[PDB]
Ligand binder design. Sequence first.
Ligand SMILES: NS(=O)(=O)c1cc2c(cc1Cl)N[C@H]([C@H]1C[C@H]3C=C[C@@H]1C3)NS2(=O)=O
Ligand SMILES: NS(=O)(=O)c1cc2c(cc1Cl)N[C@H]([C@H]1C[C@H]3C=C[C@@H]1C3)NS2(=O)=O
Lengths: 49, 49, 49
Amino acid sequence: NLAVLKLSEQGVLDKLKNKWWYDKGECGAKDSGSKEKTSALSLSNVAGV
Amino acid sequence: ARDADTKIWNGMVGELVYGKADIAIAPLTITLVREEVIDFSKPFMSLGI
Amino acid sequence: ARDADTKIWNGMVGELVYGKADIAIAPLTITLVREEVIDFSKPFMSLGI
Ligand SMILES: NS(=O)(=O)c1cc2c(cc1Cl)N[C@H]([C@H]1C[C@H]3C=C[C@@H]1C3)NS2(=O)=O
Ligand SMILES: NS(=O)(=O)c1cc2c(cc1Cl)N[C@H]([C@H]1C[C@H]3C=C[C@@H]1C3)NS2(=O)=O
């Protein structure tokens, strides 16, 4: 119980958490979704014209 | 968990209760009924259903 | 916090260290330097800086 707090306060937990969750980002689809309907148009929607 | 009507902890918690193991570093959720047979440290990683 | 060179814990710490107060249900943060003098239950509400 004493050791856990030292690891928590030194941030090794956050380091290991990033190491084993996010640094292995392979299928980085990264779709979140913003409701901001004032997003402009890209050229990629229009280039066919 | 405990068995129905017998109170026989199978699994890892039984490995702590029945003197077979020594410590369990594992993704293990602090519930109510696990406190009455074994001890937990402070929590290290937070989560939800 | 503790005093430099004399370890005089003031505030709500010394009220429990020096036998003054009996229990403290309050916004107190579990640290490393507080488990040595007093004890904490399991944490009940998460937060950050
Ligand atoms: N966001 S999380 O689950 O990965 C997470 C969760 C926790 C961490 C650290 C992290 Cl990174 N340390 C805390 C402890 C540290 C100190 C403060 C509360 C406890 C004592 N336990 S916790 O609140 O369970
Ligand atoms: N959503 S919250 O911050 O108010 C919050 C935070 C916490 C709650 C319950 C709530 Cl509602 N219980 C947990 C405890 C339950 C069990 C598991 C860890 C501790 C034991 N501590 S906690 O993680 O500090």
